[PDB]
Coordinates of C-alpha atoms and ligand atoms in Angstrom, one line a residue:
Chain A
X1 CA 0.1 -0.3 0.0
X2 CA 1.4 3.3 -1.0
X3 CA 2.1 5.9 1.8
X4 CA 0.0 9.0 2.5
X5 CA 2.5 11.3 1.2
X6 CA 3.0 9.4 -1.9
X7 CA -0.4 9.6 -2.6
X8 CA -1.1 13.1 -1.7
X9 CA 2.0 13.9 -4.4
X10 CA 0.3 11.6 -6.6
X11 CA -3.0 13.4 -6.4
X12 CA -1.7 16.9 -6.6
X13 CA 0.2 15.9 -9.8
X14 CA -2.9 14.3 -10.9
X15 CA -5.4 17.1 -10.3
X16 CA -3.6 19.5 -11.8
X17 CA -3.2 17.9 -15.1
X18 CA -7.1 17.3 -14.7
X19 CA -7.8 20.8 -14.5
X20 CA -5.5 21.9 -17.2
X21 CA -7.3 19.8 -19.5
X22 CA -10.3 20.5 -18.4
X23 CA -10.2 24.4 -18.8
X24 CA -10.8 26.1 -22.1
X25 CA -7.5 26.9 -24.1
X26 CA -5.7 30.5 -23.5
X27 CA -5.7 31.0 -27.2
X28 CA -9.5 30.6 -27.7
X29 CA -11.5 33.8 -27.5
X30 CA -12.5 35.1 -25.3
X31 CA -8.8 35.0 -24.1
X32 CA -8.9 37.1 -21.2
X33 CA -11.5 34.8 -19.9
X34 CA -9.8 32.0 -20.1
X35 CA -6.5 33.2 -19.1
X36 CA -8.5 34.4 -16.0
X37 CA -9.9 31.2 -14.8
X38 CA -6.7 29.2 -15.4
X39 CA -4.8 31.8 -13.3
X40 CA -7.3 31.8 -10.7
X41 CA -6.7 27.7 -10.3
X42 CA -3.6 26.6 -12.0
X43 CA -0.3 26.3 -10.4
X44 CA -0.7 23.9 -7.2
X45 CA -1.3 24.8 -3.7
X46 CA -2.7 22.5 -1.2
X47 CA -5.2 21.0 -2.8
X48 CA -7.3 20.1 0.0
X49 CA -10.4 19.6 -1.5
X50 CA -9.3 17.4 -4.2
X51 CA -7.4 15.4 -1.5
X52 CA -10.6 14.6 0.6
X53 CA -12.3 13.7 -2.1
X54 CA -9.8 11.1 -3.6
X55 CA -8.7 9.9 0.1
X56 CA -12.6 9.5 0.9
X57 CA -12.9 7.4 -2.1
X58 CA -9.8 5.7 -1.3
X59 CA -11.8 4.2 2.0
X60 CA -13.8 1.9 -0.1
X61 CA -11.2 1.3 -2.8
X62 CA -12.4 3.3 -5.8
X63 CA -10.2 4.5 -8.8
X64 CA -9.3 7.6 -9.3
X65 CA -11.1 7.8 -12.8
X66 CA -14.2 7.9 -10.8
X67 CA -13.3 10.1 -8.6
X68 CA -11.8 13.2 -11.3
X69 CA -15.0 15.4 -11.9
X70 CA -16.2 15.7 -7.8
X71 CA -12.1 16.3 -6.9
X72 CA -12.4 19.2 -9.7
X73 CA -15.7 20.4 -8.9
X74 CA -15.2 20.8 -5.4
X75 CA -11.7 23.1 -6.5
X76 CA -13.2 24.9 -8.7
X77 CA -15.8 26.1 -5.8
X78 CA -13.4 26.9 -4.3
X79 CA -11.2 28.7 -6.6
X80 CA -14.2 30.9 -7.9
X81 CA -14.9 31.8 -4.1
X82 CA -11.6 33.1 -3.8
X83 CA -11.7 35.3 -7.0
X84 CA -14.3 37.0 -5.8
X85 CA -13.7 37.0 -2.0
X86 CA -10.5 39.2 -2.7
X87 CA -12.2 41.7 -4.8
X88 CA -12.1 46.1 -4.0
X89 CA -15.6 45.8 -2.6
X90 CA -15.0 42.2 -0.6
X91 CA -11.8 41.6 1.2
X92 CA -9.7 43.5 -1.0
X93 CA -6.5 41.7 -1.7
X94 CA -3.7 42.4 -3.8
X95 CA -1.6 39.3 -3.6
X96 CA -2.7 35.8 -3.2
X97 CA 0.1 33.1 -2.7
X98 CA 2.8 35.5 -3.6
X99 CA 1.4 36.5 -6.7
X100 CA -1.3 39.3 -7.6
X101 CA -4.6 38.1 -7.1
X102 CA -6.6 37.5 -10.6
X103 CA -8.3 41.2 -10.2
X104 CA -4.9 42.9 -10.3
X105 CA -3.5 40.5 -13.0
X106 CA -6.6 41.4 -15.4
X107 CA -9.3 43.8 -13.9
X108 CA -12.1 43.7 -12.1
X109 CA -14.5 42.8 -14.5
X110 CA -13.0 40.0 -15.6
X111 CA -12.5 38.5 -12.3
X112 CA -16.2 38.8 -11.6
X113 CA -16.7 36.9 -15.2
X114 CA -14.4 34.3 -14.2
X115 CA -15.4 33.7 -11.2
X116 CA -18.9 33.3 -12.4
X117 CA -17.7 30.8 -15.2
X118 CA -15.4 28.6 -12.9
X119 CA -18.5 28.1 -11.1
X120 CA -20.4 27.1 -13.9
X121 CA -18.1 24.6 -15.2
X122 CA -17.7 22.8 -11.5
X123 CA -21.2 21.8 -12.1
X124 CA -20.9 21.1 -15.9
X125 CA -17.8 18.8 -15.1
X126 CA -19.8 16.6 -12.5
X127 CA -23.1 16.5 -15.0
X128 CA -20.8 15.7 -17.6
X129 CA -19.0 13.1 -15.5
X130 CA -18.9 9.2 -17.0
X131 CA -20.8 8.1 -13.8
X132 CA -24.7 6.6 -13.3
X133 CA -26.8 9.8 -13.4
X134 CA -28.0 8.8 -10.3
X135 CA -24.5 9.3 -9.1
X136 CA -23.9 12.6 -10.6
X137 CA -27.3 13.7 -9.6
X138 CA -26.3 13.1 -6.1
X139 CA -23.1 14.6 -6.4
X140 CA -24.6 18.0 -7.8
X141 CA -27.2 17.8 -5.1
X142 CA -24.3 17.7 -2.6
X143 CA -22.0 20.4 -4.3
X144 CA -25.0 23.0 -4.3
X145 CA -26.5 22.7 -1.5
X146 CA -23.1 23.4 -0.1
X147 CA -21.7 26.4 -2.3
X148 CA -25.0 28.2 -2.4
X149 CA -26.7 30.7 0.6
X150 CA -27.2 27.7 2.7
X151 CA -23.5 27.0 3.1
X152 CA -20.4 28.7 1.1
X153 CA -22.5 31.7 -0.1
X154 CA -24.1 32.2 3.1
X155 CA -21.1 32.1 5.2
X156 CA -19.0 34.5 3.3
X157 CA -22.5 36.7 3.5
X158 CA -22.2 36.5 7.2
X159 CA -18.3 37.5 7.4
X160 CA -19.4 40.5 5.5
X161 CA -22.4 41.2 7.3
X162 CA -20.0 41.1 10.4
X163 CA -17.3 43.3 9.6
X164 CA -16.5 45.7 12.0
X165 CA -18.4 44.1 15.1
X166 CA -17.4 41.3 17.2
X167 CA -18.9 37.8 16.9
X168 CA -19.7 35.6 19.6
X169 CA -18.0 32.3 19.7
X170 CA -21.5 30.9 18.7
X171 CA -22.0 33.3 15.7
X172 CA -17.7 32.9 14.8
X173 CA -18.2 29.0 14.5
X174 CA -21.4 29.0 12.5
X175 CA -20.0 31.6 10.0
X176 CA -17.4 29.1 9.9
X177 CA -19.2 26.4 9.6
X178 CA -21.5 27.6 6.3
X179 CA -18.4 29.4 4.8
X180 CA -15.6 27.2 4.6
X181 CA -17.2 23.9 6.8
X182 CA -19.9 22.9 4.3
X183 CA -17.7 22.7 1.4
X184 CA -15.2 20.6 3.0
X185 CA -18.1 18.3 4.0
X186 CA -19.3 17.5 0.5
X187 CA -15.6 16.8 -0.7
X188 CA -15.6 14.1 1.6
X189 CA -19.4 13.0 1.3
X190 CA -18.5 12.9 -2.6
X191 CA -15.7 11.1 -2.6
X192 CA -17.8 8.6 -0.4
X193 CA -21.0 8.5 -2.6
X194 CA -18.7 7.9 -5.5
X195 CA -17.0 4.9 -3.6
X196 CA -20.4 3.5 -3.0
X197 CA -21.3 4.1 0.7
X198 CA -24.0 3.6 2.7
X199 CA -25.8 6.5 4.9
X200 CA -24.3 5.1 8.4
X201 CA -20.8 5.4 6.7
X202 CA -21.8 8.9 5.1
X203 CA -22.8 10.2 8.5
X204 CA -19.9 8.6 10.1
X205 CA -17.5 10.5 7.7
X206 CA -19.4 13.8 7.7
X207 CA -18.3 13.6 11.5
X208 CA -14.8 13.7 10.6
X209 CA -15.3 16.0 7.9
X210 CA -17.3 18.7 10.1
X211 CA -14.5 18.5 12.4
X212 CA -11.9 18.6 10.0
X213 CA -13.5 22.0 8.8
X214 CA -13.1 23.4 12.0
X215 CA -9.7 22.3 12.7
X216 CA -8.2 24.0 9.7
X217 CA -9.9 27.5 10.9
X218 CA -8.9 27.1 14.4
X219 CA -5.3 26.0 13.3
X220 CA -5.5 29.3 10.5
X221 CA -6.3 31.7 13.4
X222 CA -3.4 30.6 15.6
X223 CA -0.8 30.8 12.9
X224 CA -2.1 34.2 12.3
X225 CA -1.3 35.0 15.7
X226 CA 1.8 33.2 15.3
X227 CA 2.7 35.3 12.3
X228 CA -13.1 39.7 10.9
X229 CA -12.2 41.1 14.5
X230 CA -13.1 38.2 16.3
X231 CA -10.8 35.1 16.1
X232 CA -10.6 32.0 18.7
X233 CA -7.6 33.0 20.2
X234 CA -9.4 36.5 20.8
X235 CA -12.6 34.9 21.9
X236 CA -10.4 31.7 23.9
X237 CA -7.7 33.0 24.8
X238 CA -4.5 31.2 23.0
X239 CA -4.0 28.6 25.3
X240 CA -7.9 27.6 24.7
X241 CA -7.5 28.0 21.4
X242 CA -4.8 25.3 21.0
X243 CA -7.0 23.1 23.3
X244 CA -9.7 23.8 21.0
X245 CA -7.6 22.7 18.2
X246 CA -5.9 19.6 20.4
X247 CA -9.5 18.5 21.1
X248 CA -10.4 18.7 17.2
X249 CA -7.1 16.7 16.6
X250 CA -7.8 13.9 19.0
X251 CA -12.0 13.6 17.8
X252 CA -10.8 13.4 14.4
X253 CA -8.3 10.3 14.9
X254 CA -10.9 8.8 17.1
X255 CA -13.7 8.7 14.3
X256 CA -11.4 6.8 12.1
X257 CA -10.1 4.5 14.7
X258 CA -11.6 1.6 13.4
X259 CA -10.4 1.5 9.5
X260 CA -7.1 -0.1 8.5
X261 CA -4.8 1.3 6.3
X262 CA -7.2 2.3 3.8
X263 CA -7.9 5.5 6.2
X264 CA -3.9 6.7 6.6
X265 CA -4.5 9.1 3.5
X266 CA -7.9 10.6 5.4
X267 CA -5.9 10.5 8.5
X268 CA -2.8 12.1 6.9
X269 CA -5.2 15.2 5.6
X270 CA -6.6 15.8 9.8
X271 CA -2.8 15.8 10.7
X272 CA -2.0 18.4 8.0
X273 CA -5.4 20.8 9.0
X274 CA -4.0 20.4 13.2
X275 CA -0.1 20.5 12.5
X276 CA 1.3 22.3 9.4
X277 CA 3.5 25.5 9.5
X278 CA 1.5 27.4 6.4
Chain B
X1 CA -52.5 35.3 -30.0
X2 CA -55.1 36.3 -26.9
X3 CA -55.3 33.1 -25.8
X4 CA -51.7 32.8 -25.7
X5 CA -51.4 35.8 -23.8
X6 CA -53.5 34.7 -20.9
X7 CA -51.3 31.5 -20.8
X8 CA -48.5 33.6 -20.6
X9 CA -49.7 35.7 -17.8
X10 CA -50.6 32.3 -15.9
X11 CA -47.1 30.9 -16.6
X12 CA -45.7 34.6 -15.4
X13 CA -48.1 34.4 -11.9
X14 CA -47.0 30.9 -12.1
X15 CA -42.9 31.3 -11.7
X16 CA -43.6 34.5 -9.6
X17 CA -45.3 31.9 -6.9
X18 CA -42.6 29.4 -7.4
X19 CA -39.6 31.4 -7.7
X20 CA -40.8 32.8 -4.1
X21 CA -41.5 29.1 -2.6
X22 CA -37.7 28.4 -3.7
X23 CA -35.8 31.0 -2.5
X24 CA -34.8 31.5 1.2
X25 CA -37.1 33.5 3.5
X26 CA -35.5 37.5 4.1
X27 CA -36.6 36.7 7.6
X28 CA -33.6 34.0 8.1
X29 CA -29.9 34.1 8.2
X30 CA -28.2 35.3 6.6
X31 CA -30.6 38.0 5.8
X32 CA -29.4 40.8 3.4
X33 CA -28.1 38.0 1.4
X34 CA -32.0 36.5 1.2
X35 CA -33.2 40.1 0.7
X36 CA -30.9 40.8 -2.5
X37 CA -31.6 37.5 -3.9
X38 CA -34.8 37.9 -3.8
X39 CA -34.6 41.3 -4.8
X40 CA -32.7 40.5 -7.9
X41 CA -35.4 38.1 -9.4
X42 CA -39.0 38.4 -7.9
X43 CA -41.4 41.3 -8.8
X44 CA -42.4 40.6 -12.3
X45 CA -41.1 41.0 -15.3
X46 CA -41.3 39.4 -18.7
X47 CA -39.7 35.9 -17.6
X48 CA -38.9 35.2 -21.5
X49 CA -36.8 32.5 -20.9
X50 CA -39.3 30.7 -18.2
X51 CA -42.4 31.1 -20.9
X52 CA -40.1 29.5 -23.3
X53 CA -39.5 26.7 -21.3
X54 CA -43.5 26.2 -20.8
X55 CA -44.1 26.8 -24.1
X56 CA -41.9 24.4 -25.4
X57 CA -43.1 21.7 -23.5
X58 CA -46.6 22.6 -24.3
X59 CA -45.9 21.8 -27.6
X60 CA -45.9 18.2 -26.3
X61 CA -48.9 18.5 -24.0
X62 CA -46.2 18.6 -20.7
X63 CA -47.8 20.2 -18.2
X64 CA -46.0 22.9 -16.1
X65 CA -46.0 20.7 -12.9
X66 CA -42.8 18.6 -15.2
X67 CA -41.3 22.1 -16.1
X68 CA -40.9 24.4 -13.1
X69 CA -38.1 23.3 -12.0
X70 CA -36.2 23.9 -15.4
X71 CA -38.1 27.1 -15.9
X72 CA -36.7 28.8 -12.4
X73 CA -33.2 27.8 -13.4
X74 CA -33.2 29.7 -16.5
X75 CA -34.3 32.5 -14.8
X76 CA -32.4 32.3 -11.9
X77 CA -29.2 32.1 -14.4
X78 CA -30.2 34.9 -16.4
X79 CA -31.1 37.2 -12.7
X80 CA -27.9 36.6 -11.7
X81 CA -26.0 37.5 -15.2
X82 CA -27.9 40.7 -14.9
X83 CA -27.0 41.5 -11.1
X84 CA -23.5 41.1 -12.2
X85 CA -23.5 42.8 -15.4
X86 CA -25.2 46.0 -13.5
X87 CA -22.2 46.1 -11.1
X88 CA -19.3 49.6 -11.7
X89 CA -16.7 47.3 -12.9
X90 CA -19.6 46.3 -15.8
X91 CA -22.1 48.1 -16.9
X92 CA -22.1 50.3 -14.1
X93 CA -26.3 51.0 -14.2
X94 CA -27.8 52.8 -11.0
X95 CA -31.4 51.6 -12.5
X96 CA -33.0 48.8 -14.3
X97 CA -36.5 48.9 -14.9
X98 CA -37.4 52.0 -12.8
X99 CA -36.1 50.5 -9.5
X100 CA -32.4 50.9 -8.6
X101 CA -30.2 47.9 -9.4
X102 CA -29.3 45.5 -6.9
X103 CA -25.7 46.9 -6.0
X104 CA -27.5 50.5 -5.0
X105 CA -30.3 48.8 -3.1
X106 CA -27.5 46.7 -1.0
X107 CA -24.1 46.9 -1.7
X108 CA -21.3 46.0 -4.1
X109 CA -20.8 43.0 -2.1
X110 CA -24.0 41.7 -1.1
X111 CA -24.4 41.6 -5.3
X112 CA -22.1 40.3 -6.1
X113 CA -22.9 37.5 -3.5
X114 CA -26.6 37.5 -4.1
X115 CA -25.7 36.8 -8.0
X116 CA -23.4 33.8 -7.0
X117 CA -25.8 32.2 -4.6
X118 CA -28.7 32.7 -7.7
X119 CA -26.4 30.8 -9.8
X120 CA -26.2 28.3 -7.0
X121 CA -29.9 27.9 -6.4
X122 CA -30.6 27.2 -10.5
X123 CA -28.3 24.4 -10.2
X124 CA -29.6 22.8 -6.7
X125 CA -33.2 23.2 -8.3
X126 CA -32.7 21.1 -11.3
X127 CA -30.1 19.0 -9.1
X128 CA -33.4 18.4 -6.4
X129 CA -35.9 17.9 -9.4
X130 CA -39.1 15.5 -9.1
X131 CA -37.8 13.9 -12.2
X132 CA -35.8 10.9 -13.7
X133 CA -32.2 11.8 -12.5
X134 CA -31.3 10.8 -16.4
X135 CA -33.7 14.0 -17.5
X136 CA -32.0 15.9 -14.4
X137 CA -28.5 15.1 -15.5
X138 CA -29.5 16.0 -19.7
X139 CA -31.1 19.6 -18.6
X140 CA -27.8 20.3 -16.4
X141 CA -25.3 19.5 -18.9
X142 CA -27.5 21.6 -21.1
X143 CA -27.8 24.9 -18.6
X144 CA -24.0 24.5 -17.7
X145 CA -23.0 24.3 -21.1
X146 CA -24.8 27.5 -22.0
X147 CA -24.4 29.2 -19.0
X148 CA -20.8 29.3 -18.8
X149 CA -17.5 30.1 -20.7
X150 CA -19.0 28.5 -23.9
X151 CA -22.1 30.4 -23.4
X152 CA -23.2 33.3 -21.4
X153 CA -20.2 34.0 -19.7
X154 CA -17.9 34.3 -22.6
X155 CA -20.3 36.3 -24.8
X156 CA -20.3 38.9 -21.6
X157 CA -16.7 38.6 -22.1
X158 CA -16.7 39.1 -25.6
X159 CA -18.8 42.4 -25.2
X160 CA -16.4 43.7 -22.7
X161 CA -13.2 43.1 -24.6
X162 CA -15.1 44.8 -27.7
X163 CA -15.9 48.0 -25.7
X164 CA -15.3 50.8 -27.8
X165 CA -14.3 48.4 -31.1
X166 CA -16.0 48.6 -34.2
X167 CA -17.4 44.7 -34.8
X168 CA -17.8 43.1 -37.8
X169 CA -21.5 41.6 -38.3
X170 CA -20.0 38.4 -37.9
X171 CA -18.3 38.7 -34.6
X172 CA -21.4 40.6 -33.4
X173 CA -23.1 38.2 -33.9
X174 CA -21.3 35.4 -32.5
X175 CA -21.0 37.9 -29.7
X176 CA -24.5 37.7 -29.3
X177 CA -25.0 34.1 -30.1
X178 CA -23.1 33.2 -26.7
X179 CA -24.1 36.2 -24.8
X180 CA -28.1 35.3 -24.9
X181 CA -28.6 33.3 -27.8
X182 CA -26.9 30.5 -25.5
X183 CA -29.2 30.6 -23.0
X184 CA -32.6 30.8 -25.0
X185 CA -31.4 27.8 -26.9
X186 CA -31.0 25.9 -23.6
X187 CA -34.9 27.2 -22.3
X188 CA -36.4 25.1 -25.5
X189 CA -34.2 22.5 -25.1
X190 CA -34.9 21.7 -21.9
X191 CA -38.7 22.5 -22.1
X192 CA -38.4 19.9 -25.0
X193 CA -36.3 17.6 -23.0
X194 CA -38.8 17.1 -19.9
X195 CA -41.1 16.4 -22.9
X196 CA -39.3 13.7 -24.1
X197 CA -38.6 15.4 -27.8
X198 CA -36.7 13.3 -30.0
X199 CA -33.8 14.4 -31.9
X200 CA -35.3 15.9 -34.8
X201 CA -37.9 17.8 -32.6
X202 CA -34.8 19.2 -30.3
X203 CA -32.7 20.0 -33.6
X204 CA -36.0 21.9 -35.4
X205 CA -36.6 23.5 -32.0
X206 CA -33.2 24.2 -31.3
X207 CA -33.1 26.2 -34.8
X208 CA -36.3 28.3 -34.1
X209 CA -34.5 29.2 -30.9
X210 CA -31.4 29.9 -32.5
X211 CA -33.8 32.4 -34.6
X212 CA -35.6 33.8 -31.8
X213 CA -32.5 34.5 -29.5
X214 CA -31.3 36.9 -32.4
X215 CA -34.4 38.4 -33.3
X216 CA -35.1 39.0 -29.7
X217 CA -31.6 40.8 -29.6
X218 CA -32.2 42.7 -32.7
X219 CA -35.3 44.4 -31.7
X220 CA -33.9 45.3 -28.0
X221 CA -31.5 47.6 -30.5
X222 CA -34.0 48.8 -32.3
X223 CA -36.3 49.8 -29.1
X224 CA -32.8 51.2 -27.2
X225 CA -32.4 53.7 -30.1
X226 CA -36.2 54.5 -30.4
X227 CA -21.6 48.4 -32.1
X228 CA -25.5 47.1 -32.3
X229 CA -27.0 45.6 -35.2
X230 CA -28.7 48.9 -36.2
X231 CA -25.2 50.5 -35.9
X232 CA -23.8 47.8 -39.0
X233 CA -27.0 47.4 -40.8
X234 CA -28.9 50.9 -40.3
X235 CA -31.8 50.9 -38.4
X236 CA -33.6 50.1 -41.7
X237 CA -31.2 47.2 -42.3
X238 CA -31.7 45.8 -38.4
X239 CA -35.4 46.2 -39.0
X240 CA -35.2 44.0 -42.7
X241 CA -33.3 41.4 -40.7
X242 CA -36.1 41.2 -37.9
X243 CA -39.0 40.6 -40.5
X244 CA -36.8 37.8 -41.9
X245 CA -36.1 36.1 -38.8
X246 CA -39.6 36.3 -37.7
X247 CA -40.8 34.6 -41.2
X248 CA -38.1 31.9 -40.5
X249 CA -39.5 31.3 -36.9
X250 CA -43.0 31.0 -38.5
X251 CA -41.2 28.6 -41.1
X252 CA -39.9 26.0 -39.3
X253 CA -43.1 25.7 -37.1
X254 CA -45.6 25.4 -39.7
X255 CA -46.2 21.8 -39.9
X256 CA -47.8 21.6 -36.2
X257 CA -51.2 22.3 -34.4
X258 CA -52.6 24.2 -32.2
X259 CA -49.8 22.8 -29.6
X260 CA -47.0 25.0 -31.1
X261 CA -49.5 28.5 -30.7
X262 CA -47.6 29.4 -27.6
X263 CA -44.0 29.2 -29.4
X264 CA -45.5 31.0 -32.0
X265 CA -46.4 33.5 -30.1
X266 CA -43.2 34.2 -28.2
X267 CA -41.9 34.5 -31.4
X268 CA -44.1 37.2 -32.2
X269 CA -43.5 38.9 -29.1
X270 CA -40.0 38.9 -29.4
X271 CA -40.1 40.6 -33.0
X272 CA -43.2 43.0 -32.1
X273 CA -43.3 44.2 -28.5
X274 CA -43.2 47.8 -27.6
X275 CA -41.6 46.7 -24.2
Ligands
CL301 CL1 -2.4 2.3 -2.0

């Protein structure tokens, strides 16, 4: 059995190649839109959401060809959300991962439309997947529920509404559950659906994915202090937030404790969510 | 087309009620996003694209209940595209239909997100529809292809890229075929799929829908004056092109019985409307 480290490298290379083939060429008109779409999603990175799709499918022995559309779709939703988030009317960021944000590299109109078109391509890839129609529909329902006003978009809105206000712990947790937790749970659910998981196992994996999405954000908050006025270290104290993260780490491992080596990839994504330095 | 007008009023009332039931409550969190989503699609309008879905299904005797998801989805895509198109970085409009645009009634960030969420809701409604999964997938494929970079979004980008430039007649026609032609064809296609249409009928209806989308744009350009088709062809040349499209649309549907009257009336509307 291949180690988690080897699997993550293989899946990161795989999703890079799949996304490159799935996006329109920069030489086809409209060239600026296509260039901006590619600029916004190609070029590496953690690929946490594709990795969750593959790692979840891996629990069931599912081949990557059955997972590629689901894995691309969650990265495309994630990528589009960041293109819009970076806009001057939103978070107003000029740099992302050491490179100019998409609206700086191009312009705001191009960034708006590139985000719009990446969202459509996420759904199109699922609808076009070489899978049974019932499975494509189940994946599409999952992604839509997690990405819209009941998930990612709603969480973005809760965040914008809270600009300049101090959120309570309850409200901060709820905001993160929508803004990033929902799409992280969708990634795990879709991988397991492609693995033909049944509902009890879907619910168990959802409990793991729920904890992982929060863990990632608590860790991020801790790192920000070590390197949206309300954060887990500000509301809990730094020691309290570290204890919160430590419990989520233990919780994630306990949920998967009965699996064999087939869960090592998911286990390692949990460790990365808790322990990464960047 | 008076009997058709009654049908269209029924369908405009129906799609208003359907969209109202499908959108989140303005009392529930996040309230401002939900309110902006509702502002951006409720409150009447022509409902051309839902009417095309219902009328295309009507050709096959399909009842509206089997068409609501598809009809809502094309209006939601259309609605989101206008919210983003009105933004200052795009067309920069303060009014639409005599009322403030969404980013004026709310703010730019809320409008961006409302557009994003309406797009998602369009896909979720089709995916959740009470229809065979194979039919839901075919409609979802149709909508995604027509709405993204190879359709509506691509046409919007072409339009912005040509700002201040003189376009050839071919380029302008290509731009409109993506910018609004694709989603109009999608509406007719989805109605026909829900009607269990056979491949020749789908191709026939797609020829009709292609002509209808162009005619609708040519008529909106003519009304706007009262690079565009009037600018390239003259006001008289634009009107001649409209009449040729009208005759093509009626020719394509000519062999059908009264079940095509709804589509025929939408063709007449696209050409003759004062609004
Ligand atoms: Cl292996």
